[PDB]
Amino acid sequence: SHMPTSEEDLCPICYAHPISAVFQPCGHKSCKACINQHLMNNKDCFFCKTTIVSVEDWEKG
Ligand SMILES: [Zn+2]
Numbered sequence: 778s779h780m781p782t783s784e785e786d787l788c789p790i791c792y793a794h795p796i797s798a799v800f801q802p803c804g805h806k807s808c809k810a811c812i813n814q815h816l817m818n819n820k821d822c823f824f825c826k827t828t829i830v831s832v833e834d835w836e837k838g
Pocket residue numbers: 800803804805822823824825826827
């Protein structure tokens with residue numbers, strides 16, 4: 778499936794889990810499980826493939 782309208786802030790890469798991590802200084806966001814698994818392959822910012830300098834925990838409240 779490819780749906781822009783999600784039930785919550787659900788990570789579009791995964792659907793099952795929401796966003797919890799921001800990829801600075803770009804600001805693109807996804808689930809923590811994304812980047813941790815991605816560091817076994819690359820260090821790029823997924824949706825634009827920019828170099829992630831810092832992976833911080835994006836608080837939603
Ligand atoms: Zn980006």
